[PDB]
RNA sequence: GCGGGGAUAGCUCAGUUGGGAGAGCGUCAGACUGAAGAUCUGAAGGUCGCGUGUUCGAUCCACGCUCACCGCACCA
RNA sequence: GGAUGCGAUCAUACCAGCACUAACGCACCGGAUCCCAUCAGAACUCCGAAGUUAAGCGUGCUUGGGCGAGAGUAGUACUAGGAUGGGUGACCCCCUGGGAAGUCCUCGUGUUGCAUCCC
RNA sequence: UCAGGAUAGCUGGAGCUCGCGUGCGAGUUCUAUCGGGUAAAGCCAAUGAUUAGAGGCAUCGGGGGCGCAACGCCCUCGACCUAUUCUCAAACUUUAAAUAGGUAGGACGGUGCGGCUGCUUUGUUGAGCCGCACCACGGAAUCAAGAGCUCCAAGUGGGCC
RNA sequence: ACAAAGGGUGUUGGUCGAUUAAGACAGC
RNA sequence: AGCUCAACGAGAACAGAAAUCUCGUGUGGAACAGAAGGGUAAAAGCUCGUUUGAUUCUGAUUUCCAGUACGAAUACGAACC
C-alpha cells in the first residue's frame, strides 16, 4: 500500500504544500503534537531534553506518529502520566507524489501519495520537559523514539528552563527580580516600555535587562 | 506573440514599491529633457501608456528626440554577434535623468585648471587619476594587546540562542 | 469583545497620502494637468491665475511651478481694496472682479506691457478677450479654481472677468459668467454688468429695507456705518476701478519687523527633562 | 476653556423618517404620500441592495422610502412622535454617537385621518444631535474630524432629552 | 522518434567568434523618426542661414 | 490499481433552491364483524457510514478516510 | 516666533488619548432676494459680520502604536572560485573572496521655497 | 514541416580602406552611477497553512448543581477578545544577498561672441543648427600577433559527456 | 565499477561522573 | 462634475443571521466583462450631464524577429470633432 520510506528519504524537489493548486491530499498520520501534562505551569518542569536531527532528509508523518506514541508510552510507564510534557516540534507539510503504474513515462506527474516533513541538520524533532528527577527516563524515552526515525539523531540536554527561551540561571534571576510573568508554558519578560499606567505596582522598571 | 505576451513575467518588474503607490509626485512632470542627456529607464506600473518593453527596464540610454509627452531613447541591445542601437519612445513617467556622468564635467574643469597652472609655472603634468596604490610605511604606537585563541567546542551552542 | 481595527499590522501597511491631500487643500489630478508642460517646450513655464475665497478675503495671484516650490509673479488681495476705496463687500462678485482687475494691472505693470495692453476701462458685461498686438502676444495664464464648485455666476468667474478686462489672455468660455441662461445658451450682458457693479446686492438691500428694516440694519450694518446706499454702489465701484487703473503698483509696508520675536508656543522638552519626569512618575507608581 | 460656551449648545441637526416595506407599488406610493403630507417635502425611495428570497425582495426594487427634515418642521415632528411615545424612551435607544430614535406603529397617531384605502403604516424616527462646528466634517475643502470632547455623547444626548422634553428614560 | 527540443549551448561561443561588434557611431546621426515639426523648422533655418 | 454511483427505522427506498425526518413491509394495540378474512386507525422503530470544515442553521454543500456494487486495458 | 495662499519632499510628516495659544489671520458662525442646489440652504452656491475661540488649523506631553536611524543578530544564514578534500551516502571541513534578514536594545517624531500679514 | 528544404548563425576564398602605438579596439579590472526579487530570511508584518496553553467577556451555545420559572446564582467544555506560542509556502511576502546585467570616464571637448528659423515664448524667451576667437599633456589600470568595410560560396541544422 | 540501520567486554586514543591509605573492587 | 467601496461597532415598529434608515471607524480587506498577475480612492470604482477620438491621411517605432510578414501596442505629424 505504501512505498518504503527509502524512496522519499532524500529532499530532492521544491516544497509541495497542500494548496489550491495541489488538491486531494490525504491527511497526515499525526494530528496530536502535545501529550502529557501540556497544561502544567512553566515553573514546574525546568528540565528539557531534545531529540535533534543530524541529517537533511524527509521524515514521514507515520514515522512522527510512531515516535510520539512510543515516547509517550514509555514516559507514562516510567515516570507516570503526570510527570512530563512531550512536544513534537516538526509538522509534515510537504506532499509526496506517486506515479501509479498512460503507458510509460508519458504524463508522469504523480498524484499525492502522502505527507512528510523537511528536516534540516540540527533541527529539533522532539522535546520533553519534566522535573530533574525524570531526566534519565526522558533520555531513555528519546533513545527509544530514535529507532522510529530514519537517518541520524542526537539527544541534547537543553540549558533552557522547560520550553522557555531563557537559560535556567537567567530565568531564576529574572523571577527573583520579579520580571517574569507566567503565560501557560511560556514566560513573558518585563521590559521598560509601553504605557506606564499599564504596569502594576513594582512591575515598572526604569531600564531593561 | 509566439508563446509570450508583451508583459509576460512582469509580476515583480512592473509592480510599484511597497507603500509607494497612488498619485505621482509633480517632480516627475517638472523635469527637463534635452537631446544627448543620459536617462535611466524605470517603468512606473501605474502609467500604462508609453510603456517600454520589459527588456529596456533597468537600462540606461541617451535621448535622441523630445515630444510633447515622451522622449526618444536609444538603448544598446545584444542580438547574437552584434549590438543594435534600438530607438524607442518612452513617456517621461517611465524615465529618470541618469547620474552616470555627473562628475565628468567637474573633472574636466579641474583638469583644465591644473593644466593651465602647470603651463603658467612652466611644468608638464598628467591630470589622469590613478587607481588606489600601495601605501607607504608608517609607525604604529604600541598599545595593549588582546590575545585571540580558538574557542573550545560546545555542542550546546550550535543552535542560534542555544538548544 | 470587539476586535481592534487600528491594529499594528494596519498601521504597518498604511500608506499616507500627500500632505496637501490629507489637509484637503490641493487636488493633485487638477494640479498635474494644470502644470504639466510639453517637454519639447523645455523650461517654458505655465502661469496659472490662482483665485481663492476665504470667509472674509479674496486671494488672487499668478504662480509658476518649480521643483523647490511654486513662485508668485504677482499677487492681489481684497484687503488692499480699501486703499482704492472699497471698504465693504470684500467677498462678493464685485470685489472678485476688482481683485482680478488689480492683479491683471499689477502683473502687466511688472511685465511692462500695461501700455501695450489696456483692456477696456469700462466694465461691460459682454464676453471680452484682449486683442493681440503686433509687438508681442498678450500675457497668458490658466485659471485655477481649486476645490470650489464651478457653478454659473461664481465669484471665481467674476474675478476671471475682472482679469480679462484688465487685459490678460485667460482661456475661457462664457457659459459660467453671471447672467448666463441655462434655458437659452446666451449670455445676458445686462445681468452680467449688474453683477459686476454689484446691483444684485443693491436689489437685495432695497428689498430688505422695504420688507424688514430691522433685518436690513442687521444684515448691512457695515454698509450703513460707511454710509453707502444701494444707488451709490455702482458709482463707488466705478471709482474703485478708476483708482485701480490709475495706480496698480503694490504698496510696500512701512512697518519695521521686531528685533526679537516672542515665543507663545510650548517648546519641545529636552531628553534630560523627559527622563526626569519619567523617573518621577515611575517612582510615584512604584511607591504604592 | 469651559463648557458654558454658547458654541457647545446641543441642537437637533436632522430628523429622518423611514418606512421600509418589502413590497413595491401601490403600498409604497401610499407610504410616500403619507411621508410627503407629514413632512412637507418629497420623500426619496430606497432600493434593495441584495436579493433575499425569504423577504420576497429583488435587487433594485424600491423596497423603502424615507425623508429628512430639518428645523422647526423636524422639531414639531419629533414633538409629535414623543407625544405618541408618551415621552418614554429606552436607555438602549440612544447610540454612542449622540444620536437616538424610536418607532411608531400607527401614523394616524401623528395627526393623519385614517383612510382604509391607504391602510395603516408604521414609521421609524431617528434624531441626530450635533453641536455647532460639525461642518468641519461635512464641508468639501479641509475636511476634518470633530473634536472628541466637542462630539455629542450618549450621556449628553440623554441629558438633553431629559432636560428639554422632561422625558423619562427606562432601563428594562 | 523524439529529438531534442531546444538549447543555447555553443551559441555564446558562436557569437564571440567574430563579435560582439559595436557599430561605429558617426558624428551625425539620422534624423528619421524625430519630431516632424522640429525637423521642418530646422530645414527652414538651414535654408535661410 | 484506477473511473463512476451508493451508505437513512428490524428490512426495502424518497428527500433537499440547504430551516420537514418521510413512505411501503415487519411488531403491538384499537376500530369494524354474529365470529373471522380483508380493510382502516394509532404507537414504537433514525450516531441519515466515520472524522473534519463552510453556514445563523448541514442528511443535504466541500475535504479526508471506512464498507459493499458496476466499468476497466490494441498490433506483435 | 508664527499664521494664511500656493507648494516641494510625501509618516521623523500617520493614528489614539490628554493640555495650551497674545495679535493679524484662518475658522466656526447669521440668512436664502438674487446666481446656484438638493428629499433635505446638511452639502454646494450667493449675500453678510451678531456672537465664539467650543470645534477646526497650530503647538506641547504619553516609560503609547506606527514610522526613520543606529547597535546587535553576525562574519551567523547564504554565496562566486579550488581541491586525485572527508564521507557508503546524506551532507560537510578547509583554501582565495563577497556577505544578509526577524527577535532584543538605544535614539528621534519633520525639513523646507515664493508671496501677504501679525508679533 | 519532424530521416527533407530554405533562412540567420558558425567557415573558406577574394580582397579593399586605412595604421605602426599618437591605437574609433577588449568574453578583464578600477572609479562613479542605475535596475533586480533568486539564495537566505519572515509570519512576534499582508495573503494562505498550522500546534499549544494563559488571562478576561456575553439579555444571544452544549451541560452539571442549587431552582416551578427568573434578563436568578456557582462551575465544565465550546465559541469570542487580549498578550503569548510550535511548525510552514514553486504559482505568499515587509526585508533582502553572492554571482551576473546596463551606462559613463574628452580631440565627435569646453568657453566667449555673432548669425538663421516658417518651431517655441508675454518677452531675439527658449530649442536646434551655423560662422569667428582662444584653450584643450591626450584625461583610470592592463593589453592591443592592428582596426574597419564589402562580395561569392561550402558544410552544418540527429548530437553526446 | 556499491553497501546501510543496528551491534562487539577486539584493540587504540579522548569527554563527563563515582569510590579510595580515617584503607577503592572480588575471595576468604 | 459629484461621491466612496467591502467590512465592522453602536442605534431605529413589524425586522430576526439576512429588507430600509442614522452616526462612527474603515489603505481598498470592494469594484473595474472574462483566466491570472499587475494597476487605480476628491479614481481607473458608483451616480449623473454632454457626446461618438470605436473618425480621415499616410509614414516612424516596440513586441515576434531572419531584426521578414501578420496580430497587438506606443510617440509624433497633417485635418475634422
Ligand atoms: K534513527
Ligand atoms: K526576512
Ligand atoms: K502569516
Ligand atoms: K542549411
Ligand atoms: Mg481650539
Ligand atoms: Mg513608540
Ligand atoms: Mg541542405
Ligand atoms: Mg540571472
Ligand atoms: Mg472624476
Coordinates of N, CA, C and O in Angstrom, one line a residue, chain A residues 75-195:
Chain A
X75 N 7.2 7.1 28.6 CA 7.2 8.1 29.6 C 6.1 7.8 30.6 O 6.3 7.9 31.8
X76 N 4.9 7.5 30.1 CA 3.8 7.2 31.1 C 4.1 6.0 31.9 O 3.8 5.9 33.1
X77 N 4.8 4.9 31.3 CA 5.1 3.7 32.0 C 6.1 4.0 33.1 O 6.0 3.4 34.2
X78 N 7.1 4.8 32.8 CA 8.2 5.0 33.7 C 8.0 6.1 34.8 O 8.0 5.8 36.0
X79 N 7.7 7.3 34.3 CA 7.6 8.5 35.2 C 6.2 8.7 35.6 O 5.9 9.5 36.6
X80 N 5.2 8.2 34.9 CA 3.8 8.4 35.2 C 3.2 9.4 34.2 O 3.9 10.1 33.4
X81 N 1.9 9.4 34.1 CA 1.1 10.2 33.1 C 1.1 11.7 33.5 O 0.7 12.5 32.6
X82 N 1.5 12.1 34.7 CA 1.5 13.5 35.1 C 2.9 13.9 35.5 O 3.0 14.6 36.5
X83 N 4.0 13.5 34.8 CA 5.3 13.8 35.2 C 6.2 14.3 34.0 O 7.4 14.5 34.2
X84 N 5.5 14.6 32.9 CA 6.3 15.1 31.7 C 5.3 15.8 30.8 O 4.1 15.7 30.9
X85 N 5.9 16.5 29.9 CA 5.2 17.1 28.7 C 6.1 16.9 27.5 O 7.2 17.3 27.4
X86 N 5.5 16.3 26.5 CA 6.2 15.9 25.2 C 5.6 16.7 24.1 O 4.3 16.7 23.9
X87 N 6.4 17.4 23.3 CA 6.0 18.2 22.2 C 6.8 17.8 20.9 O 8.0 17.8 21.0
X88 N 6.1 17.4 19.9 CA 6.7 17.2 18.6 C 6.9 18.5 17.9 O 5.9 19.3 17.8
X89 N 8.1 18.8 17.5 CA 8.5 20.1 17.0 C 8.6 20.2 15.5 O 9.3 21.0 15.0
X90 N 7.9 19.3 14.8 CA 8.0 19.2 13.3 C 6.7 18.8 12.8 O 6.0 17.9 13.3
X91 N 6.2 19.6 11.8 CA 4.9 19.4 11.1 C 5.1 19.0 9.7 O 5.8 19.7 9.0
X92 N 4.5 17.8 9.2 CA 4.7 17.4 7.8 C 3.8 18.2 6.9 O 2.6 18.1 6.9
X93 N 4.4 19.1 6.1 CA 3.7 20.0 5.2 C 4.0 19.7 3.8 O 3.3 20.2 2.9
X94 N 5.1 18.9 3.5 CA 5.4 18.6 2.1 C 4.6 17.4 1.6 O 4.6 16.3 2.3
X95 N 4.0 17.5 0.5 CA 3.2 16.5 -0.1 C 4.1 15.6 -1.1 O 4.7 16.2 -2.0
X96 N 4.1 14.3 -0.8 CA 4.9 13.4 -1.6 C 3.9 12.8 -2.6 O 2.8 12.2 -2.3
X97 N 4.3 12.8 -3.9 CA 3.5 12.3 -5.0 C 3.9 10.9 -5.4 O 5.0 10.3 -4.9
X98 N 3.2 10.2 -6.3 CA 3.5 8.9 -6.8 C 2.9 8.8 -8.2 O 1.8 9.3 -8.4
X99 N 3.6 8.2 -9.1 CA 3.1 7.9 -10.5 C 2.7 6.5 -10.5 O 3.5 5.6 -10.8
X100 N 1.4 6.2 -10.3 CA 0.9 4.9 -10.2 C 0.9 4.2 -11.6 O 0.2 4.6 -12.5
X101 N 1.8 3.2 -11.7 CA 1.8 2.3 -12.9 C 1.0 1.1 -12.7 O 0.1 0.7 -13.4
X102 N -0.8 7.3 -20.6 CA -1.0 6.2 -19.6 C 0.3 5.4 -19.5 O 1.0 5.4 -18.5
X103 N 0.6 4.6 -20.6 CA 1.7 3.7 -20.6 C 3.0 4.5 -20.6 O 3.1 5.6 -21.2
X104 N 4.0 4.0 -19.9 CA 5.3 4.5 -19.9 C 5.4 5.8 -19.0 O 4.6 6.0 -18.1
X105 N 6.4 6.7 -19.4 CA 6.6 7.9 -18.6 C 5.8 9.1 -19.2 O 6.0 10.2 -18.7
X106 N 5.0 8.9 -20.2 CA 4.1 10.0 -20.7 C 3.2 10.4 -19.6 O 2.6 9.6 -18.9
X107 N 3.1 11.8 -19.4 CA 2.3 12.3 -18.4 C 2.5 11.7 -17.0 O 1.6 11.2 -16.3
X108 N 3.8 11.8 -16.6 CA 4.2 11.1 -15.4 C 3.9 11.8 -14.1 O 4.1 11.2 -13.0
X109 N 3.5 13.1 -14.1 CA 3.3 13.8 -12.9 C 2.4 13.1 -11.9 O 1.2 12.8 -12.2
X110 N 2.9 12.7 -10.8 CA 2.2 11.8 -9.9 C 1.2 12.5 -9.1 O 1.1 13.7 -8.9
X111 N 0.3 11.7 -8.5 CA -0.8 12.2 -7.6 C -0.3 12.2 -6.2 O 0.6 11.4 -5.8
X112 N -0.9 13.0 -5.3 CA -0.5 13.0 -3.9 C -0.5 11.6 -3.3 O -1.6 10.9 -3.3
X113 N 0.6 11.1 -2.8 CA 0.7 9.9 -2.1 C 0.7 10.0 -0.5 O 0.0 9.2 0.1
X114 N 1.4 11.0 0.0 CA 1.4 11.2 1.4 C 1.9 12.5 1.8 O 2.1 13.4 1.0
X115 N 2.2 12.7 3.1 CA 2.8 13.9 3.6 C 4.0 13.6 4.5 O 4.1 12.6 5.1
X116 N 4.9 14.6 4.5 CA 6.2 14.4 5.2 C 6.7 15.8 5.6 O 6.2 16.8 5.2
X117 N 7.7 15.8 6.5 CA 8.3 17.0 6.9 C 9.8 17.1 6.4 O 10.5 16.1 6.5
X118 N 10.2 18.3 6.0 CA 11.5 18.5 5.5 C 12.3 19.0 6.7 O 12.1 20.1 7.3
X119 N 13.3 18.2 7.1 CA 14.1 18.5 8.4 C 15.5 18.8 8.0 O 16.1 18.1 7.1
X120 N 16.0 19.9 8.5 CA 17.4 20.3 8.3 C 18.3 19.7 9.4 O 17.9 19.2 10.4
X121 N 19.6 19.9 9.1 CA 20.6 19.4 10.1 C 20.5 20.3 11.4 O 20.4 21.5 11.3
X122 N 20.5 19.6 12.5 CA 20.4 20.4 13.8 C 19.0 20.8 14.2 O 18.8 21.5 15.1
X123 N 18.0 20.3 13.4 CA 16.6 20.7 13.7 C 16.0 19.8 14.8 O 16.2 18.6 14.8
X124 N 15.4 20.5 15.8 CA 14.8 19.7 16.9 C 13.6 18.9 16.4 O 12.7 19.5 15.7
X125 N 13.6 17.6 16.7 CA 12.4 16.8 16.3 C 11.5 16.6 17.5 O 10.3 16.8 17.3
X126 N 12.0 16.2 18.7 CA 11.1 16.0 19.8 C 11.7 16.8 21.0 O 12.9 17.0 21.1
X127 N 10.8 17.3 21.9 CA 11.1 18.0 23.1 C 10.4 17.4 24.2 O 9.2 17.1 24.1
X128 N 11.0 17.2 25.4 CA 10.4 16.7 26.6 C 10.8 17.6 27.7 O 12.0 17.8 28.0
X129 N 9.8 18.2 28.5 CA 10.1 18.9 29.7 C 9.5 18.2 30.9 O 8.4 17.7 30.9
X130 N 10.3 18.1 31.9 CA 10.0 17.4 33.1 C 10.8 17.9 34.3 O 11.6 18.8 34.1
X131 N 10.7 17.3 35.5 CA 11.5 17.6 36.6 C 12.9 17.0 36.5 O 13.1 16.1 35.7
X132 N 13.8 17.4 37.4 CA 15.1 16.9 37.4 C 15.2 15.4 37.7 O 16.1 14.7 37.3
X133 N 14.1 14.9 38.4 CA 14.1 13.5 38.8 C 13.7 12.5 37.7 O 13.8 11.3 38.0
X134 N 13.3 13.0 36.5 CA 13.0 12.2 35.4 C 13.8 12.4 34.2 O 13.5 12.0 33.1
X135 N 15.0 13.0 34.4 CA 15.9 13.2 33.3 C 16.3 11.9 32.6 O 16.3 11.9 31.3
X136 N 16.7 10.9 33.3 CA 17.2 9.7 32.7 C 16.0 9.0 32.0 O 16.2 8.4 30.9
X137 N 14.8 9.0 32.6 CA 13.6 8.5 31.9 C 13.4 9.2 30.6 O 13.1 8.6 29.6
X138 N 13.5 10.5 30.6 CA 13.3 11.3 29.4 C 14.3 10.9 28.3 O 14.0 10.7 27.1
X139 N 15.6 10.8 28.7 CA 16.6 10.5 27.8 C 16.4 9.1 27.2 O 16.6 8.9 26.0
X140 N 16.0 8.1 28.0 CA 15.7 6.8 27.5 C 14.5 6.7 26.6 O 14.5 6.0 25.6
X141 N 13.5 7.5 26.9 CA 12.3 7.6 26.0 C 12.7 8.2 24.7 O 12.3 7.7 23.6
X142 N 13.6 9.2 24.6 CA 14.0 9.8 23.4 C 14.9 8.7 22.6 O 14.8 8.6 21.4
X143 N 15.7 8.0 23.4 CA 16.5 6.9 22.7 C 15.6 5.9 22.1 O 16.0 5.3 21.0
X144 N 14.5 5.5 22.8 CA 13.6 4.6 22.2 C 13.0 5.1 20.9 O 12.8 4.4 19.9
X145 N 12.6 6.4 21.0 CA 12.0 7.1 19.8 C 12.9 7.1 18.7 O 12.5 7.2 17.5
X146 N 14.2 7.2 19.0 CA 15.3 7.3 17.9 C 15.1 6.2 16.8 O 15.2 6.5 15.6
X147 N 14.7 5.0 17.2 CA 14.6 3.9 16.3 C 13.5 4.0 15.3 O 13.4 3.3 14.3
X148 N 12.5 4.9 15.6 CA 11.4 5.1 14.7 C 11.7 6.1 13.5 O 10.9 6.1 12.6
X149 N 12.8 6.8 13.6 CA 13.1 7.8 12.6 C 14.3 7.3 11.7 O 15.1 6.5 12.1
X150 N 14.3 7.7 10.4 CA 15.5 7.4 9.6 C 16.6 8.4 9.8 O 16.5 9.4 10.5
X151 N 17.8 8.1 9.3 CA 18.9 8.9 9.4 C 19.5 8.9 10.9 O 19.3 7.9 11.6
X152 N 20.2 9.9 11.2 CA 20.9 10.0 12.5 C 20.3 11.1 13.3 O 19.9 12.2 12.8
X153 N 20.1 10.8 14.6 CA 19.6 11.8 15.6 C 20.6 11.8 16.8 O 21.4 10.9 17.0
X154 N 20.4 12.9 17.6 CA 21.2 13.1 18.8 C 20.4 13.6 19.9 O 19.5 14.4 19.7
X155 N 20.6 13.1 21.1 CA 19.9 13.6 22.3 C 20.7 14.7 23.0 O 21.9 14.5 23.3
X156 N 20.1 15.9 23.2 CA 20.8 17.0 23.7 C 20.0 17.6 24.9 O 18.8 17.8 24.7
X157 N 20.7 17.8 26.0 CA 20.0 18.3 27.2 C 20.1 19.8 27.1 O 21.2 20.4 27.1
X158 N 18.9 20.5 27.0 CA 18.9 21.9 26.9 C 19.3 22.6 28.2 O 19.0 22.1 29.3
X159 N 19.9 23.8 28.0 CA 20.2 24.6 29.1 C 19.1 25.6 29.5 O 19.2 26.3 30.4
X160 N 18.0 25.6 28.7 CA 16.9 26.5 28.9 C 16.0 25.9 30.0 O 16.0 24.7 30.3
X161 N 15.1 26.8 30.5 CA 14.1 26.4 31.5 C 12.9 25.9 30.8 O 12.1 26.6 30.2
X162 N 12.6 24.5 30.9 CA 11.5 24.0 30.2 C 11.5 24.3 28.7 O 12.5 24.1 28.1
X163 N 10.3 24.8 28.2 CA 10.2 25.1 26.8 C 10.4 26.6 26.6 O 10.1 27.1 25.5
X164 N 10.8 27.4 27.6 CA 11.1 28.8 27.5 C 12.4 29.1 26.8 O 13.2 28.2 26.5
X165 N 12.6 30.4 26.5 CA 13.8 30.8 25.7 C 14.9 31.3 26.7 O 15.9 31.7 26.1
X166 N 14.7 31.2 28.0 CA 15.7 31.7 28.9 C 16.5 30.5 29.5 O 15.9 29.4 29.7
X167 N 17.8 30.7 29.7 CA 18.6 29.7 30.4 C 18.0 29.6 31.9 O 17.3 30.4 32.3
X168 N 18.4 28.5 32.5 CA 17.9 28.3 33.9 C 18.3 29.4 34.8 O 17.5 29.9 35.6
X169 N 19.6 29.7 34.8 CA 20.1 30.8 35.7 C 19.4 32.1 35.4 O 19.0 32.9 36.3
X170 N 19.3 32.5 34.1 CA 18.7 33.7 33.7 C 17.2 33.8 34.2 O 16.7 34.8 34.6
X171 N 16.5 32.6 34.0 CA 15.1 32.6 34.4 C 15.0 32.7 35.9 O 14.1 33.5 36.4
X172 N 15.9 32.1 36.7 CA 15.8 32.2 38.1 C 16.1 33.6 38.5 O 15.4 34.2 39.4
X173 N 17.1 34.3 37.9 CA 17.4 35.6 38.3 C 16.2 36.6 37.9 O 15.9 37.5 38.7
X174 N 15.6 36.4 36.7 CA 14.5 37.2 36.3 C 13.3 37.1 37.3 O 12.7 38.1 37.7
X175 N 13.0 35.8 37.7 CA 12.0 35.6 38.7 C 12.3 36.3 40.0 O 11.4 36.8 40.7
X176 N 13.6 36.2 40.4 CA 14.0 36.8 41.7 C 13.7 38.3 41.6 O 13.3 38.9 42.6
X177 N 14.1 39.0 40.5 CA 13.8 40.4 40.3 C 12.4 40.7 40.0 O 12.0 41.9 39.9
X178 N 11.5 39.7 39.8 CA 10.1 39.8 39.6 C 9.8 40.4 38.2 O 8.9 41.2 37.9
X179 N 10.6 39.9 37.2 CA 10.5 40.3 35.8 C 9.8 39.3 34.9 O 9.8 39.4 33.7
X180 N 9.3 38.2 35.5 CA 8.7 37.1 34.7 C 7.2 37.0 35.0 O 6.8 37.0 36.2
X181 N 6.4 37.0 34.0 CA 5.0 36.7 34.0 C 4.7 35.3 33.5 O 5.1 35.1 32.3
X182 N 4.2 34.4 34.3 CA 3.9 33.1 33.7 C 2.7 33.1 32.7 O 1.6 33.6 33.1
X183 N 2.9 32.6 31.5 CA 1.9 32.5 30.5 C 1.8 31.1 30.0 O 2.5 30.7 29.0
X184 N 1.0 30.3 30.6 CA 0.9 28.9 30.3 C 2.3 28.2 30.4 O 2.9 28.3 31.5
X185 N 2.8 27.6 29.4 CA 4.2 27.1 29.4 C 5.2 28.1 29.1 O 6.4 28.0 29.5
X186 N 4.8 29.2 28.5 CA 5.7 30.3 28.2 C 5.9 31.2 29.3 O 5.2 31.2 30.3
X187 N 6.9 32.1 29.3 CA 7.2 33.1 30.3 C 7.5 34.4 29.6 O 8.2 34.5 28.6
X188 N 6.9 35.5 30.1 CA 7.0 36.8 29.5 C 7.9 37.6 30.3 O 7.8 37.7 31.5
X189 N 8.9 38.3 29.6 CA 9.9 39.1 30.3 C 9.4 40.5 30.3 O 8.9 41.1 29.2
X190 N 9.5 41.2 31.4 CA 9.1 42.6 31.6 C 10.2 43.5 31.1 O 11.3 43.4 31.6
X191 N 9.8 44.5 30.3 CA 10.7 45.5 29.8 C 10.5 46.8 30.5 O 10.0 46.9 31.6
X192 N 10.9 47.9 29.8 CA 10.8 49.2 30.3 C 10.1 50.1 29.2 O 10.4 51.3 29.0
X193 N 9.1 49.5 28.6 CA 8.3 50.2 27.5 C 6.8 50.0 27.7 O 6.4 49.2 28.6
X194 N 6.1 50.7 26.9 CA 4.6 50.6 27.0 C 4.1 51.7 27.9 O 4.8 52.4 28.6
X195 N 2.8 51.7 28.0 CA 2.1 52.7 28.9 C 2.5 52.4 30.4 O 2.3 51.3 30.8

